[PDB]
Amino acid sequence: AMRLPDGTLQVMVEARARAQVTDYIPGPYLRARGEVFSEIFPIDEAVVRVLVEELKEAFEKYVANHKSLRLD
Amino acid sequence: AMRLPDGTLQVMVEARARAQVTDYIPGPYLRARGEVFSEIFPIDEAVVRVLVEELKEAFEKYVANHKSLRLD
């Protein structure tokens, strides 16, 4: 948590788990509660590894076609 | 800039950058407002390096195609 000298809030976040929204409170600042935290762990991890391999091959096919687009 | 005594001022320049001429002030000699050193380098330097080596080899093949012209 740091401050920048031009009225702009710089912060680094790291996401843990997604959630639903219970009720919308008017703002600013906007407030909302979470009904449950929707979380999951990989079931039958061999098929999970196969899908990771297929997605790795897809993203390797994705990054090779760049001449002036500037994707790092 | 070696001061030659034959009415000619042969200047040796290792240039810096191109710039847009915003306006011209009448002379001679002329004043011209331009822009700053256009010398920055963007992200994705790997495509820059690959196209640099390909441009190098393309001129290396090009100058062989104009040895009929005896290009330098």
XYZ file of N, CA and C in Angstrom:
432
model
N 0.839 -1.193 0.000
C 0.000 0.000 0.000
C 0.875 1.245 0.000
N 0.889 1.957 -1.127
C 1.715 3.144 -1.296
C 0.857 4.282 -1.820
N 1.416 5.489 -1.788
C 0.749 6.685 -2.292
C 1.602 7.308 -3.394
N 0.938 7.802 -4.469
C 1.549 8.527 -5.571
C 1.262 10.020 -5.452
N 2.217 10.897 -5.808
C 2.034 12.349 -5.552
C 1.248 13.082 -6.636
N 0.151 12.477 -7.094
C -0.700 13.104 -8.098
C -2.172 12.762 -7.900
N -2.534 12.343 -6.688
C -3.911 12.028 -6.356
C -4.435 10.770 -7.015
N -3.623 9.716 -7.015
C -3.991 8.451 -7.641
C -3.490 7.323 -6.754
N -4.389 6.416 -6.388
C -4.117 5.382 -5.399
C -3.559 4.147 -6.094
N -2.310 3.816 -5.782
C -1.629 2.642 -6.310
C -1.692 1.531 -5.268
N -2.202 0.366 -5.660
C -2.332 -0.772 -4.758
C -2.159 -2.058 -5.565
N -1.544 -3.064 -4.942
C -1.338 -4.381 -5.535
C -2.252 -5.373 -4.829
N -3.134 -6.018 -5.585
C -4.047 -7.006 -5.027
C -3.696 -8.379 -5.583
N -4.132 -9.411 -4.868
C -4.000 -10.791 -5.302
C -5.262 -11.549 -4.921
N -5.956 -12.049 -5.939
C -7.274 -12.639 -5.771
C -7.180 -14.026 -5.150
N -8.152 -14.331 -4.290
C -8.240 -15.620 -3.619
C -9.392 -16.463 -4.148
N -10.610 -15.922 -4.140
C -11.788 -16.691 -4.512
C -12.894 -15.746 -4.958
N -13.651 -16.188 -5.957
C -14.788 -15.425 -6.439
C -15.965 -15.560 -5.476
N -16.961 -14.696 -5.660
C -18.116 -14.687 -4.776
C -19.325 -14.126 -5.510
N -20.505 -14.420 -4.969
C -21.744 -13.798 -5.411
C -21.959 -12.476 -4.685
N -23.065 -11.817 -5.014
C -23.426 -10.537 -4.421
C -24.794 -10.672 -3.762
N -24.849 -10.409 -2.454
C -26.103 -10.524 -1.717
C -27.023 -9.343 -2.001
N -26.585 -8.135 -1.653
C -27.440 -6.960 -1.748
C -26.591 -5.760 -2.140
N -27.148 -4.937 -3.026
C -26.486 -3.738 -3.518
C -26.860 -2.536 -2.663
N -25.868 -2.001 -1.968
C -26.006 -0.781 -1.176
C -25.598 0.390 -2.064
N -26.396 1.459 -2.139
C -26.010 2.611 -2.963
C -24.777 3.313 -2.414
N -24.064 3.984 -3.308
C -22.858 4.687 -2.950
C -22.740 6.002 -3.690
N -21.501 6.473 -3.934
C -20.192 5.965 -3.508
C -19.919 6.191 -2.016
N -19.237 5.268 -1.335
C -18.642 4.066 -1.926
C -19.612 2.887 -1.924
N -19.520 2.049 -2.952
C -20.461 0.958 -3.150
C -20.126 -0.196 -2.216
N -21.163 -0.775 -1.616
C -21.027 -1.885 -0.688
C -21.896 -3.046 -1.148
N -21.403 -4.258 -0.905
C -22.129 -5.470 -1.249
C -21.601 -6.617 -0.404
N -22.508 -7.510 -0.027
C -22.187 -8.677 0.780
C -22.068 -9.879 -0.144
N -21.500 -10.964 0.357
C -21.400 -12.206 -0.398
C -22.260 -13.285 0.230
N -23.078 -13.946 -0.598
C -23.932 -15.022 -0.102
C -23.078 -16.211 0.324
N -22.375 -16.822 -0.630
C -21.345 -17.814 -0.347
C -20.145 -17.513 -1.232
N -18.986 -18.019 -0.827
C -17.777 -17.940 -1.635
C -17.722 -19.192 -2.506
N -17.905 -19.015 -3.812
C -17.879 -20.124 -4.758
C -16.437 -20.540 -5.022
N -16.059 -21.716 -4.526
C -14.707 -22.242 -4.657
C -14.777 -23.654 -5.221
N -13.683 -24.089 -5.838
C -13.624 -25.428 -6.410
C -12.169 -25.881 -6.403
N -11.973 -27.204 -6.310
C -10.710 -27.901 -6.455
C -10.811 -28.907 -7.597
N -9.714 -29.140 -8.345
C -9.783 -30.012 -9.531
C -10.128 -31.468 -9.241
N -11.260 -31.916 -9.775
C -11.734 -33.283 -9.593
C -11.175 -34.115 -10.741
N -10.656 -35.310 -10.412
C -10.097 -36.297 -11.339
C -8.933 -35.687 -12.117
N -7.839 -35.390 -11.406
C -6.758 -34.504 -11.835
C -6.004 -34.963 -13.085
N -6.188 -36.200 -13.553
C -5.551 -36.625 -14.797
C -6.143 -35.889 -15.996
N -7.476 -35.789 -16.047
C -8.151 -35.032 -17.099
C -7.857 -33.542 -16.953
N -7.666 -33.080 -15.714
C -7.227 -31.713 -15.453
C -5.849 -31.461 -16.056
N -4.923 -32.414 -15.912
C -3.594 -32.273 -16.500
C -3.641 -32.339 -18.025
N -4.523 -33.177 -18.582
C -4.687 -33.247 -20.037
C -5.212 -31.922 -20.588
N -6.193 -31.323 -19.910
C -6.705 -30.018 -20.312
C -5.686 -28.899 -20.137
N -4.850 -28.971 -19.099
C -3.746 -28.028 -18.945
C -2.756 -28.158 -20.101
N -2.464 -29.394 -20.528
C -1.567 -29.611 -21.666
C -2.164 -29.079 -22.968
N -3.467 -29.284 -23.171
C -4.109 -28.793 -24.388
C -4.180 -27.269 -24.402
N -4.441 -26.654 -23.244
C -4.455 -25.199 -23.154
C -3.057 -24.604 -23.296
N -2.031 -25.318 -22.820
C -0.644 -24.908 -23.033
C -0.275 -24.936 -24.511
N -0.695 -25.987 -25.229
C -0.458 -26.051 -26.673
C -1.219 -24.955 -27.414
N -2.438 -24.645 -26.961
C -3.217 -23.578 -27.584
C -2.573 -22.209 -27.365
N -2.073 -21.947 -26.153
C -1.457 -20.648 -25.897
C -0.082 -20.538 -26.546
N 0.605 -21.665 -26.758
C 1.820 -21.629 -27.564
C 1.513 -21.352 -29.029
N 0.385 -21.857 -29.535
C -0.037 -21.473 -30.876
C -0.498 -20.023 -30.954
N -0.926 -19.438 -29.834
C -1.470 -18.082 -29.848
C -0.390 -17.006 -29.938
N 0.788 -17.248 -29.359
C 1.795 -16.211 -29.142
C 2.778 -16.111 -30.313
N 2.694 -17.020 -31.283
C 3.678 -17.094 -32.354
C 3.350 -16.195 -33.542
N 2.112 -15.718 -33.656
C 1.716 -14.896 -34.795
C 1.704 -13.408 -34.465
N 2.877 -12.799 -34.294
C 2.946 -11.374 -34.003
C 4.076 -10.725 -34.786
N 3.726 -9.692 -35.549
C 4.684 -8.876 -36.288
C 4.638 -7.399 -35.921
N 3.466 -6.834 -35.633
C 3.352 -5.429 -35.264
C 2.309 -5.220 -34.171
N 1.821 -6.306 -33.575
C 0.743 -6.242 -32.594
C 1.221 -5.927 -31.181
N 2.494 -6.201 -30.869
C 3.113 -5.984 -29.554
C 2.379 -6.730 -28.435
N 2.437 -8.058 -28.505
C 2.138 -8.909 -27.360
C 3.443 -9.571 -26.950
N 3.801 -9.439 -25.672
C 5.151 -9.750 -25.221
C 5.404 -11.254 -25.206
N 33.246 19.228 -38.074
C 33.029 20.062 -39.254
C 34.382 20.677 -39.614
N 35.084 20.045 -40.550
C 36.399 20.502 -40.978
C 36.223 21.727 -41.864
N 36.755 22.860 -41.415
C 36.622 24.114 -42.147
C 37.472 24.068 -43.412
N 36.822 23.818 -44.552
C 37.488 23.746 -45.841
C 37.580 25.128 -46.471
N 38.764 25.539 -46.907
C 38.898 26.850 -47.553
C 38.631 26.815 -49.050
N 37.462 26.320 -49.452
C 37.032 26.384 -50.848
C 35.554 26.746 -50.932
N 35.091 27.570 -49.997
C 33.707 28.018 -49.961
C 32.710 26.935 -49.612
N 33.169 25.857 -48.983
C 32.324 24.710 -48.701
C 32.584 24.261 -47.273
N 31.521 24.139 -46.483
C 31.646 23.712 -45.093
C 31.126 22.281 -44.991
N 32.027 21.328 -45.217
C 31.708 19.903 -45.199
C 31.515 19.464 -43.755
N 30.266 19.259 -43.357
C 29.954 18.845 -41.996
C 29.768 17.328 -41.965
N 30.338 16.692 -40.947
C 30.180 15.266 -40.707
C 29.192 15.083 -39.567
N 28.049 14.467 -39.857
C 27.020 14.273 -38.843
C 26.690 12.791 -38.703
N 26.770 12.312 -37.466
C 26.115 11.078 -37.053
C 24.759 11.504 -36.513
N 23.700 11.207 -37.261
C 22.403 11.796 -36.980
C 21.784 11.196 -35.721
N 20.685 11.805 -35.283
C 20.026 11.386 -34.058
C 18.616 10.860 -34.298
N 17.736 11.685 -34.856
C 16.322 11.354 -34.873
C 15.605 12.229 -35.886
N 14.522 11.683 -36.425
C 13.624 12.444 -37.279
C 12.661 13.256 -36.424
N 12.127 14.333 -36.999
C 11.178 15.174 -36.281
C 10.293 15.934 -37.258
N 9.036 16.129 -36.866
C 8.082 16.926 -37.623
C 8.390 18.413 -37.518
N 8.550 19.053 -38.670
C 8.730 20.497 -38.754
C 7.367 21.133 -38.526
N 7.195 21.821 -37.394
C 5.911 22.462 -37.128
C 5.722 23.697 -37.999
N 6.756 24.524 -38.123
C 6.663 25.730 -38.931
C 8.034 26.080 -39.489
N 8.046 27.056 -40.384
C 9.273 27.587 -40.951
C 9.302 29.094 -40.757
N 10.457 29.604 -40.349
C 10.648 31.041 -40.175
C 11.461 31.542 -41.361
N 11.004 32.588 -42.054
C 11.680 33.025 -43.282
C 13.062 33.618 -43.037
N 14.001 33.205 -43.882
C 15.356 33.690 -43.852
C 15.761 34.219 -45.212
N 16.891 33.734 -45.762
C 17.868 32.773 -45.229
C 18.808 33.405 -44.189
N 19.279 32.661 -43.182
C 19.027 31.227 -43.013
C 17.734 30.967 -42.259
N 17.298 29.716 -42.297
C 15.970 29.366 -41.828
C 16.013 28.862 -40.391
N 14.974 29.201 -39.632
C 14.693 28.597 -38.338
C 13.532 27.635 -38.524
N 13.553 26.519 -37.805
C 12.436 25.590 -37.885
C 12.249 24.903 -36.546
N 11.046 25.017 -36.002
C 10.699 24.316 -34.781
C 10.310 22.880 -35.108
N 10.845 21.944 -34.331
C 10.644 20.538 -34.623
C 10.040 19.735 -33.491
N 10.562 18.531 -33.268
C 10.191 17.725 -32.117
C 11.435 17.120 -31.488
N 11.219 16.449 -30.359
C 12.276 15.892 -29.522
C 12.838 14.620 -30.146
N 13.908 14.094 -29.542
C 14.579 12.896 -30.034
C 13.648 11.688 -30.027
N 13.215 11.292 -31.223
C 12.331 10.145 -31.438
C 13.191 8.889 -31.408
N 13.677 8.538 -30.216
C 14.666 7.462 -30.124
C 14.281 6.402 -29.101
N 13.041 6.361 -28.637
C 12.654 5.423 -27.593
C 12.438 4.055 -28.227
N 12.434 3.013 -27.401
C 12.260 1.658 -27.876
C 11.124 0.984 -27.120
N 10.171 0.369 -27.809
C 8.976 -0.149 -27.144
C 9.203 -1.512 -26.495
N 8.099 -2.076 -26.006
C 8.039 -3.432 -25.472
C 8.093 -4.425 -26.625
N 8.203 -5.719 -26.287
C 8.312 -6.840 -27.221
C 9.552 -6.657 -28.091
N 10.736 -6.690 -27.468
C 11.968 -6.457 -28.215
C 12.385 -7.673 -29.034
N 11.769 -8.835 -28.791
C 12.147 -10.039 -29.527
C 11.717 -9.955 -30.985
N 10.520 -9.420 -31.242
C 10.064 -9.220 -32.616
C 10.912 -8.151 -33.297
N 11.340 -7.142 -32.527
C 12.264 -6.125 -33.029
C 13.571 -6.767 -33.475
N 14.120 -7.660 -32.647
C 15.401 -8.294 -32.950
C 15.292 -9.255 -34.131
N 14.195 -10.017 -34.204
C 13.986 -10.953 -35.309
C 13.810 -10.203 -36.625
N 13.025 -9.120 -36.616
C 12.839 -8.361 -37.848
C 14.087 -7.558 -38.204
N 14.915 -7.216 -37.209
C 16.215 -6.599 -37.471
C 17.151 -7.573 -38.179
N 17.244 -8.815 -37.685
C 18.069 -9.814 -38.367
C 17.517 -10.177 -39.742
N 16.190 -10.180 -39.897
C 15.593 -10.478 -41.195
C 15.791 -9.330 -42.178
N 15.761 -8.085 -41.692
C 16.056 -6.942 -42.552
C 17.526 -6.925 -42.942
N 18.392 -7.359 -42.022
C 19.817 -7.480 -42.304
C 20.085 -8.510 -43.396
N 19.498 -9.701 -43.268
C 19.630 -10.726 -44.298
C 18.926 -10.352 -45.597
N 17.837 -9.581 -45.524
C 17.129 -9.175 -46.732
C 17.922 -8.146 -47.519
N 18.600 -7.218 -46.835
C 19.496 -6.317 -47.555
C 20.755 -7.040 -48.014
N 21.184 -8.064 -47.266
C 22.329 -8.872 -47.680
C 22.038 -9.639 -48.967
N 20.805 -10.113 -49.131
C 20.384 -10.717 -50.387
C 20.048 -9.681 -51.454
N 19.520 -8.522 -51.050
C 19.148 -7.436 -51.951
C 20.362 -6.851 -52.657
N 21.439 -6.607 -51.905
C 22.641 -6.023 -52.479
C 23.322 -7.010 -53.419
N 23.078 -8.314 -53.242
C 23.553 -9.301 -54.202
C 22.709 -9.298 -55.470
N 21.419 -8.965 -55.363
C 20.566 -8.798 -56.533
C 20.821 -7.502 -57.279
N 21.628 -6.606 -56.727
C 21.918 -5.376 -57.438
C 23.422 -5.164 -57.454
N 24.151 -6.276 -57.496
C 25.496 -6.305 -58.041
C 25.485 -6.183 -59.554
N 24.353 -6.490 -60.193
C 24.130 -6.080 -61.573
C 24.126 -4.561 -61.675
N 23.631 -3.893 -60.638
C 23.755 -2.455 -60.490
C 25.040 -2.046 -59.781
N 25.774 -3.013 -59.215
C 26.965 -2.812 -58.377
C 26.688 -1.850 -57.227
N 25.664 -2.198 -56.458
C 25.336 -1.490 -55.235
C 26.470 -1.668 -54.233
N 26.685 -0.642 -53.407
C 27.808 -0.647 -52.478
C 27.652 -1.741 -51.431
